[PDB]
Write a protein that binds this ligand. Structure first.
Ligand SMILES: CC(C)C[C@H](N)C(=O)O
Ligand SMILES: O=c1cc[nH]c(=O)[nH]1
Ligand code: SF4
Lengths: 1011, 1010
C-alpha cells in the first residue's frame, strides 16, 4: 500500500489534530451562543442560582496551592532586597527567604523560616487578609500579572512540613536545663488559649522557661481559630498541629479554669507564686443591639457567638466529645454586620441549609470592613448585599421570626449618619444572625484584672511597645487590647510581649538581658544533621562553595560569604604581574536558553570576562587575612599561567605561602584545541610542575569543551593532581539581535567573541562530565560546578560522585544568603532518608495525589471513571454528585476520629555526605545493558487532567498517533499502540498526571515493512 | 590596610543587602500598622474617597499588556488542541496560533491571524467581555494561576501591527481586477458604519467585490465604538485604524445619509441599481420611561444616548470637526440601569466632575448583567450601588432635579417581581442618567425597510444561519437583529452575512459558489515576501525543515508536515537490515535546564533513542512516494552504517535510487571518543565512500561533542561532502531523583545511559558551531540544527552562516503548524528591514519606552526628576500631580493636530535569504579585536523601575558594590564605580529599564594593590 499515508483508523485518531488554515471559518452567532455552554469553566454571569452547599465544608480558599502551582509562583517572585512584603507583614516574616526555599524545592527550610517568626504560620497562611498586609506591599503589583500569592505559598510549605510529622525541639543553643539559671523556672501564667497566648508561650519556651501554663476557659483550645472561623477556610487539624508544636516545648494547657472573680484572678495568681501573667482572653461577648432583646434561638435569632460555635462543633472533628447536629437553618437568613464575622456567618448559614442569605449593612459598599478576599467568597455563593439599612423591628408570628423592619440610613454634608423614619424596608426572613462584632463586657472578668488600668474603650491599657499593663508583672495582647483585628497581629502581640516578660522576670531574679531583643528561631531535629564532608585531606563544614567567578571578584565578598555560611570559596583566578589582564565591557549577559523570561531564575549567563584584574599580591594577602579570620572555612587559590614551568612553580608557591588550603589550576591559557586544558599532555606536565613546587593539595579545573574529558582528568591524576574541578563554562554564542549584531557587543564596531555559558542550562553537560570521571577514575576527588542552584541539584551531583559543590550563577541570580537555603535543604533531604513512613516521597515532595487546582478530588464512586471533566454540563454533574454525597454524609452523623498526631522517628541512622557520594553511579551503564524486554506504556489519570491535548498533539506530530482525544470531553486515552517513548509525560503541564507503567500486552516494534 | 574588608563607604552602600538572620525579629503591632502605609501598592480598603478623575481619559483596563508582560503570558498559554477558548469566541479566532506567534515574538503573524477572522481585532481585544466568551472556556482556569489574558494578548499583537503602519492589500489569490467576472461589480449597499457593516463590507471586499458603499447617518464612523464606548476603554485611534484597513480594500463610506422613509429606503436602493443591502444600523433610540418625559439636560436629566456621545465628542480627538465641551456634571449623579451602558455612564460621569455616583437598579446584585470586568471598574472608582429600587418620580424644584423617589422591589414565591408602595427611598441627586438600554422605534426608519417582516420584538426577522431577511436581497446583523450583545458578535454577524450575500449576488448573475463557505484570510504586502533559498544546487521553498528525529518517526508524519507548509524534511536515520535496532522505554524526557516548569516551552529534552526501527525498504519506498506527491519539497534521507566501506556505499545507493534529493550521514556509530563523527580521519573516509557511490548531494551531520568541530567539518569537506549539518545533540544527563534513581530509568534495574540534549538550552552551542564553521570554510553550505523555535531564532542562524534551518524540539513542544508562524515571521523580519521609519526597532519589537504595567508613563514636568516611586505616599503625590495636569489639560485644550495615518512604504529593496546569510560574521573575532578603551556603564530609568533591588543585590554579591539602593524609595542609582560588567541589566525583570551607555568619566581598572 501507500506507506506514507495514514490509514482510516489513524485518520480518525488525528481528527482533532491542529492543521494549518487557508480560509476564515464560518460559524453563526446563534450556533456560537449554543456551543459556549459546553466548554464553560468559570462562573456563568447569567446564573442567579447558587449551587447546593449544605453540609459541604470543603476548602473554598482561592489561594490554596498544590506543588505544581507553588513551584510556578515561587519562581515568579523577584525575591527582593529589603522586601516591602516583609515590611508589611506584622510578624516580619522573611518572605524573600522562604519563597526562595520553595522555588528550590526546600519546603522544610521555607517552613522553618515561616515558623521562626510566626508559630501559627499555617493558620496565618490560610486566613491572613494579605491584600491589606504583605501582598499589599508586593513589588510585583507593578506588573500586569500582579502580586505574589504569599499566603498560598506560606500555606503550602507549612502543609508539607506538617505532613513530614517532625517535632519542634528545645532551642539547641540553650544549656541542658539542669544548668539553667533559677530564673527560668519562674511560674508563668497565660490566660486564654488563642493565637496571642499560644505565640507568647511558644516564644517564652524558646527562651528556656520551663514552667509555662495556659489557663483556658473552654474545653477546646485555639480560640477563635477553633470556635468560629469556619472549617471550609481553616481546617481544625491545622490548629491542632500548631498546638502540638507548642507542647513539644513543654507548655502546659489547663482547660476549665477562667480568669474571673471567684476563679482565677491576678490576686490568686500572685498568692500562688506566679511571677508573670499574660492576658490573651480575646473579646468574649457579642456586640448587641437593644432591638433584639428577648429573642431566642427557638424563634430563629442568633448572635455570632451562638451560631458560629454551633457550626464549628458539628464540623470540626476533634473539637468536642459531642457529635453536634448541624443547626437546621431553613429559609431566608438575615445576617447583620460588615466585618469578617458577618461574612463567615453568611457562608456558614448556607452550609446549614439556608435557602437565601441577606447581608445587611448600616453603611454602604465602600465601607465594608472585611477585605475583598473575604467578601468575594460570599458574593460567589450568591449572598445578596443590602446597604444603608438599620434594623428597627423584628416580627414574630407563630413562635418564629417572619420579618425584620429596617430604616434607611444616609449621610449629609457634614458626613453624619442619619436614619430616615419615613423610609422603611420590610424584609421577610426566618433566621436573624447579628454579627456586629465583639466586646469585653463581663464585670467579673474585669474585676479579676484588678488593679490594672482600663482605657476609654473599657479595655486593658498596655504600653504598645512592650505590651505591659499598668502592673509590671502583667502583660496583655491580641483582641483584648483592641488594636489587633487579625490572627497574625495577635500572634505578633504575644511575640512582642514574650521579650519584655523575659526582661521583667530576669530582672526580678537580679539578672539583665541584652539591650537588643534576641528571640530564638524555630528548631527541629533536622537542624542537628551533620553536613560536613572530608575530601583530599581537607575538612569542609558544608559541601557548598563559591566558584572562581564574579561572586569572588573581591576578597571582601568572600568574607561576607563566609559570614553568611558558605563552606568554602575560590579566589577569582589570578596570575603573575606580567600576565595582568584588562576586561572589556559589556561582558556578562543573560541567557536566551529559556526564552524571553526576565528577572529571577535566568537559565544561563554568557560571559567574555577574563581572569582577575586584581594582582597576585592582593590575592595572596587576602588569602592570609581570610584564613586568619575563618580557619574552618576552606580557601582555594585559583591560578593561571602560560605554558611555562618556571611560571607555574613561582605562582603556585606564592599562593601556597599565602596559606591557601589548596590550589585550583585554571587550564584556560592558550598554547600552540588551543587551551592547555584541551590537550592531555599539556595538562599532565602542568600538574607535574605544580606537584614538584607545592605540598598542599591542588585540583585541575577541566574544560567541558573537549572530545574526551576523562582523558584530561586521567592526565591530571597521572601528573599528580589531588582532584579535578568539573567543569568550567561551555563555549557558546548566546544570540544575535535581529539586525545581526551580537550581545555582548563591545565598542562602536559592536564586536564580540565566543564566551562561556554557565548556569542550569549547562547542568546536563556538567552532570555527565562528573559522572563519566567518577565512573572511570573511582575515588578521584571531584569538585562539581555547573548549574547547581539548590540542595536538591547539589545532591544529584553528590550522588554522581562529586564531594563538594561550587556555585556561581545561582548567586548571580540572587545573593549570598541562598547558602542558608542550601544547608537546611541538604539537612532535610538527608534526615528524610531515615523516615520509613515517607519512603513514597521524592525528597521533600509528597507523592502526588489526584487533585484539581491544588485541592484533592473527592474520592466518590459515582464521581470516578464516569468521564466527567471539570467544565460545562459535566461540571454541573460533578457538583450534583458531590452535593448528594454531602447530604448522605449528613443523614448518617458518625465518624469523628481525627487521628492523634505522633511524630515519625528515624529508623536508621541519618546518612552523612560520605554515605551518599557516588551511590547513583551503579544505575549508569552502556546501552547494551538497558533492557529492551521490559517496556512501558503511558497511562493518564483523568481526574488530574486539564484537557489541553498537549499529550495528543505531541504523540501525533512527534510520536506514534496512539492517543485518542475525545471531541466532547477533551479527555485523552492512551491506546495499545503506545511505545512508551514518554514524550507525552514530558510535555504534560500537570505533574504526575501521566505515568509510565509496565506494559502488559504483547509488544512488537513497528518496522513499517518486514526485515 | 585589611584588603578583605569593606571600607566604611562600601559598608554604607551595602546597608540594605540581604544577610542571614540569627534571631526572630521584634516589631510592635503599632509600629507595623504605621510602617505599612509607606510601602502600599494596591487600593486601601479603608479609603472611601474616589481619587478624582475629572477630564482623565487615560486607559483603565486591567488587561492591557506591554511587551514584557505579553511575552510572559503568551509563554504561559498551553496552546491547546481543539482549543475551547476558540470554541467560545464568536468569531472563532485561532487563539492557539496567534498566542503561539506572540510567544515566538512574531507579532505580525499574530495580528494577521487575528484580523483574518475578526477585522475589528484591536477593538475586540480591548472591549470583549472575555469572561463570558473565550476566557470563560480557557483550560487554564483549572490551575491556581488561572485563565489566560486572551484579550490583552490580542490587543498587544494588534497594537504592534498598528504601529508598523502596514496596509491591508487586495486578496492576492484573486485574478486581476480586469479579469474579474461581471458579478463582482454588483452595487452593494450597507446601512450604518458600525462593527457589523465594517465586518460585512471587509469580507465582501476580500471576496473581490469592487463597488461597496457604506451609508452612515452621522458625520462620524465606527458606531457605538466611537459614539458611546469611553475613550478610557477604547481609544478613538483604534477605530480609525480599523476603518482605514477596510478602506484599503476600496470600500467607500458616505456620511450624512440615513435609512429613513424620506431618504434611503429599500425601494430607492432597488431603483438606483443596488443588487444587495445589509442593514447594520443598530438600535438608535434609548429606552425611556414615562417618569422622565419633559425633563431637559439643563434640568439634569440625560439618557445614555444623550450623555455618552457628548463625552465622546469632547474626549475623542478627530471624532468630530467641532471641538465640544465636556458636560457640566456637578454634584450627585444617579445612573439607572445595570448593563454595560450604565457602568460606562457611571465612570464617564466622574470624568465630567461628579462628586458622587449612585448606580441604582431594580433587581439585586446577583441580577447585574454586565460582566464582572465592567463592574469592577465602577467599584474601584467608588461608585455606590443601590439594589432593589425602581424609580417612581423625579423631584424638580427651581427648574432642576433635586431628588428621585424610588420604591423597593422584591422577589416572591414564583420569582416574579413586585413593587412595594409603602417602602420608599428619597435619594437626593442633581443629575439623572437613564441607561435602560436601546431600541428601534423611529417609524420613518421602520417604514424605509418595507416590506421585510419584523418579529414580536419589533426587529427585522432573519434566518440565523444566513442573516437573510424575508426579502432575499436584504440581510441584517448586529444589534438591530437582537441576538448580538457585543462588538465581536456584531462582527461575526457581518462575517456570516457576507458569504450568503456573496451567494445571492453570484446566483443573480447566473453563477454558483462552493457548497462549503470559504472566506479569504487577511493579507498585507508582508505576505508577498519571497523566503526561498538555494543551497547545494537544491531549491528550498522556505528554509524551515524537520530534523531527523521523533517528528519524522513515520513518513505519514512527513506527508502531513509538507501539507502544513514545511520546506523540507529529513527521514529518521535508517540503516541496513543487519543493523536493525530495538528501542527501549522510557527514552525521551523533559529538560531540567530551566527549573520545575511543566507544559509548554520546555527548554530542552534528553533522549536515549536509537536510529529508526523501520526498515530501509519502508523508508526508500516512502521517499519515492513523498517525492512523487511533493516535488517542490526537499526530502533528505538520513542514513547510518558501521565503519564499513561496502555498507555505506550500498545504503547510500539504495537511498539515492529512491529519489532522495540529498543524503544526510549520521556519524553516531561506534567504531578520542567512541563515535565515528568524533575522529576526522573516520569522517573523511566515510564521506569519501559515499561520494564515490552516489551523485546527489550529501551532508555530514556533525556532533558537537568534540574539541574542535571545524576539524570534523573540514574532514567531511575533504571527503567530498556538499555541506554539513550542525549540530546533533549534546551529550548529557538530565538528572536524578532524590533517592539516586535516574530519569529516564529503564527496566526493573532502573538503569540509564548517557543521552543527547536537544532544544533551546543547546542553542548557544549550535550557534557557536555554525559561526565557527562558516568563518573557517566560507561558502560551505551549513544546515543549522539546535534550539531553533521561531523565525527570530532562525534568522540568527542564517545571520551566522547557515542556509537552511532544521527543527525538532520546537515541534515536540507543539505540533507541525508552527511552520506557519515561522514563515510569516521571517517574511515580516525581512520586510521590516526595508522600512526606514522602523529602523529603531529590534526586529518586530518596538523601541521600549517608559511604561508601568505596560501603560505609558505620563511625561509631565512635575513628575520627573522628582524621585516618586509608584507606592505609598509617593504614589499619592504622583496621582495628585497627574490630576492637576488633567485639569490644566482641560484648558490648554487642543484636538486639531491629528495625523493622517499614511502607511510606511519600503524605501530600499526587501532582502532575500541569500542577502542575510553570514552577515553577522563581520562582528565576530578574537578577544584581542575587542576595544578595552570604549567602556560602558549601567544607567537605570527610574520611571520604569519596580523597586525590587535585584540590580543592587547582584552588584553587591557578584559585582562591584556600585549601586545605591535608597531605603525610603527603593530606587537604585548606579554610581561612578560601575565597571560595565552588565550583570545588573541581565537580571532586571523590566526589559530595557537598565541601559549600558558609553563611559564619560575616566576609567581605571580595579587592581586591589598596586
Ligand atoms: C601588577 C600591575 C598592576 C603593576 C603594579 N601597579 C606594580 O606594582
Ligand atoms: O576560566 C574562565 C575565565 C573567565 N570566564 C569563564 O567562564 N571561565
Ligand atoms: S532590577 Fe530593575 S526593576 Fe529591580 S530595582 Fe533594579 S532597575 Fe529597578
Amino acid at each position: 500500500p501507500v506507506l506514507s499515508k495514514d490509514v482510516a483508523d489513524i485518520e480518525s485518531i488525528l481528527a482533532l489534530n491542529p492543521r494549518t488554515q487557508s480560509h476564515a471559518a464560518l460559524h453563526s452567532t446563534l450556533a456560537k451562543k449554543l456551543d459556549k455552554k459546553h466548554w464553560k469553566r468559570n462562573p456563568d454571569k447569567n446564573c442567579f442560582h447558587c449551587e447546593k452547599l449544605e453540609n459541604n465544608f470543603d476548602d473554598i480558599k482561592h489561594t490554596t496551592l498544590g506543588e505544581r502551582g507553588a513551584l510556578r509562583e515561587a519562581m515568579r517572585c523577584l525575591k527582593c532586597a529589603d522586601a516591602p512584603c516583609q515590611k508589611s507583614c506584622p510578624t516580619h516574616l522573611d518572605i524573600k527567604s522562604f519563597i526562595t526555599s520553595i522555588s528550590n524545592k526546600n519546603y522544610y527550610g521555607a517552613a522553618k523560616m515561616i515558623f521562626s517568626d510566626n508559630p501559627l504560620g499555617l493558620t496565618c497562611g490560610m486566613v491572613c487578609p494579605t491584600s491589606d498586609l504583605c501582598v499589599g506591599g508586593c513589588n510585583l503589583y507593578a506588573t500586569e500579572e500582579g502580586s505574589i500569592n504569599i499566603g498560598g505559598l506560606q500555606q503550602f510549605a507549612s502543609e508539607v512540613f506538617k505532613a513530614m510529622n517532625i517535632p519542634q525541639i528545645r532551642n539547641p543553643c540553650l544549656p541542658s536545663q539542669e544548668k539553667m539559671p533559677e530564673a527560668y523556672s519562674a511560674k508563668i501564667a497565660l490566660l486564654g488559649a488563642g493565637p496571642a497566648s499560644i505565640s507568647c508561650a511558644s516564644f517564652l519556651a524558646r527562651l528556656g522557661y520551663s514552667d509555662i501554663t495556659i489557663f483556658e476557659k473552654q474545653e477546646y483550645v485555639g480560640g477563635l481559630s477553633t470556635s468560629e472561623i469556619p472549617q471550609f477556610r481553616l481546617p481544625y487539624d491545622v490548629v491542632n498541629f500548631e498546638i502540638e508544636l507548642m507542647k513539644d516545648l513543654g507548655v502546659k494547657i489547663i482547660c476549665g479554669k477562667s480568669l474571673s472573680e471567684n476563679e482565677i484572678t491576678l490576686n490568686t495568681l500572685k498568692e500562688e507564686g506566679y511571677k508573670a501573667a499574660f492576658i490573651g482572653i480575646g473579646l468574649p461577648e457579642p456586640k448587641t443591639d437593644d432591638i433584639f432583646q428577648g429573642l431566642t434561638q427557638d424563634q430563629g435569632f442568633y448572635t455570632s457567638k451562638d451560631f458560629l460555635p454551633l457550626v464549628a462543633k458539628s464540623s470540626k472533628a476533634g473539637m468536642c466529645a459531642c457529635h453536634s447536629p448541624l443547626p437546621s437553618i431553613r429559609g431566608a437568613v438575615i445576617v447583620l454586620g460588615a466585618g469578617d464575622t458577618a461574612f463567615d456567618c453568611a457562608t456558614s448559614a448556607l452550609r446549614c441549609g439556608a435557602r437565601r442569605v441577606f447581608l445587611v449593612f448600616r453603611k454602604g459598599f465602600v465601607n465594608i470592613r472585611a477585605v475583598p478576599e473575604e467578601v468575594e467568597l460570599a458574593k460567589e455563593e450568591k449572598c445578596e448585599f443590602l446597604p444603608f439599612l438599620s434594623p428597627r423591628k423584628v416580627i414574630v408570628k407563630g413562635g418564629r421570626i417572619v420579618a425584620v423592619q429596617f430604616v434607611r440610613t444616609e449621610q449629609d454634608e457634614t458626613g453624619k449618619w442619619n436614619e430616615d423614619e419615613d423610609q422603611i424596608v420590610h424584609l421577610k426572613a426566618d433566621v436573624v444572625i447579628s454579627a456586629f462584632g465583639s466586646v469585653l463586657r463581663d464585670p467579673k472578668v474585669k474585676e479579676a484584672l484588678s488593679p490594672i488600668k482600663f482605657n476609654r474603650w473599657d479595655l486593658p491599657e498596655v504600653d504598645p511597645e512592650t505590651m505591659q499593663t499598668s502592673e509590671p508583672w502583667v502583660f496583655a495582647g491580641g483582641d483584648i487590647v483592641g488594636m489587633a483585628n487579625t490572627t497574625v497581629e495577635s500572634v505578633n502581640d504575644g511575640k512582642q510581649a514574650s521579650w519584655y516578660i523575659h526582661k521583667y522576670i530576669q530582672a526580678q531574679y537580679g539578672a539583665s538581658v541584652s539591650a537588643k531583643p534576641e528571640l530564638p528561631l524555630f528548631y527541629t531535629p533536622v537542624d542537628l544533621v551533620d553536613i560536613s564532608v572530608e575530601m583530599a585531606g581537607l575538612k569542609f563544614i558544608n559541601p557548598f562553595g563559591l566558584a572562581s567567578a564574579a561572586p569572588t571578584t573581591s576578597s571582601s565578598m568572600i568574607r561576607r560569604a563566609f559570614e553568611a555560611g558558605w563552606g568554602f570559596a575560590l579566589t577569582k583566578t589570578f596570575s603573575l604581574d606580567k600576565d595582568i589582564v584588562t576586561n572589556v565591557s559589556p561582558r556578562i549577559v543573560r541567557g536566551t536558553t529559556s526564552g524571553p523570561m526576565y528577572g529571577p531564575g535566568q537559565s544561563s549567563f554568557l560571559n567574555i570576562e577574563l581572569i582577575s584584574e586584581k594582582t597576585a599580591a592582593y590575592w595572596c594577602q587576602s588569602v592570609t587575612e581570610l584564613k586568619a579570620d575563618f580557619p574552618d572555612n576552606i580557601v582555594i587559590a585559583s591560578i593561571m599561567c602560560s605554558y611555562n614551568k618556571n611560571d607555574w612553580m613561582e605562582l603556585s608557591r606564592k599562593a601556597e605561602a599565602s596559606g591557601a588550603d589548596a590550589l585550583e589550576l585554571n587550564l584556560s591559557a592558550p598554547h600552540g584545541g588551543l587551551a592547555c586544558g584541551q590537550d592531555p599532555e599539556l595538562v599532565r606536565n602542568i600538574c607535574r610542575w605544580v606537584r614538584q613546587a607545592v605540598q598542599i593539595p591542588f585540583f585541575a579545573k577541566l574544560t567541558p569543551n573537549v572530545t574526551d574529558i576523562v582523558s584530561i582528568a586521567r592526565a591530571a591524576k597521572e601528573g599528580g593532581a589531588d582532584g579535578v574541578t568539573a567543569t568550567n563554562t561551555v563555549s557558546g554564542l548566546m544570540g544575535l539581535k535581529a539586525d545581526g549584531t551580537p550581545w555582548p557587543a563591545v565598542g562602536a564596531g559592536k564586536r564580540t567573541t565566543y564566551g562561556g555559558v554557565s548556569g542550569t542550562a549547562i547542568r546536563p553537560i556538567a552532570l555527565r562530565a562528573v559522572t563519566t570521571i567518577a565512573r572511570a577514575l573511582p575515588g578521584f576527588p571531584i569538585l562539581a560546578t555547573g548549574g547547581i542552584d539548590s540542595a536538591e541539584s547539589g545532591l544529584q551531583f553528590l550522588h554522581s560522585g562529586a564531594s563538594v559543590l561550587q556555585v556561581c550563577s545561582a548567586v548571580q541570580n540572587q545573593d549570598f544568603t541562598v547558602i542558608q537555603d542550601y544547608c537546611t535543604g541538604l539537612k532535610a533531604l538527608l534526615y528524610l532518608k531515615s523516615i520509613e513512613e515517607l519512603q513514597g516521597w521524592d525528597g521533600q515532595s509528597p507523592g502526588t495525589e489526584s487533585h484539581q487546582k491544588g485541592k484533592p478530588v473527592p474520592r466518590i464512586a459515582e464521581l470516578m471513571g464516569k468521564k466527567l471533566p471539570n467544565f460545562g454540563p459535566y461540571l454541573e454533574q460533578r457538583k450534583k454528585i458531590i452535593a448528594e454525597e454531602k447530604m448522605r454524609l449528613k443523614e448518617q452523623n458518625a465518624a469523628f476520629p481525627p487521628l492523634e498526631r505522633k511524630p515519625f522517628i528515624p529508623k536508621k541512622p541519618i546518612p552523612a555526605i560520605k554515605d551518599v557520594i557516588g551511590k547513583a553511579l551503579q544505575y549508569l551503564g552502556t546501552f547494551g545493558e538497558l533492557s529492551n524486554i521490559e517496556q512501558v506504556v503511558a497511562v493518564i489519570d483523568e481526574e488530574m487532567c486539564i484537557n489541553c491535548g498537549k499529550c495528543y498533539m505531541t504523540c501525533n506530530d512527534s510520536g506514534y498517533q496512539a492517543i485518542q482525544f475525545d471531541p466532547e470531553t477533551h479527555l485523552p486515552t492512551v491506546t495499545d499502540t503506545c511505545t512508551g517513548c514518554t514524550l507525552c509525560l514530558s510535555v504534560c503541564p500537570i505533574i504526575d498526571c501521566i505515568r509510565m507503567v509496565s506494559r502488559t500486552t504483547p509488544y512488537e516494534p513497528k518496522r513499517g515493512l518486514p526485515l
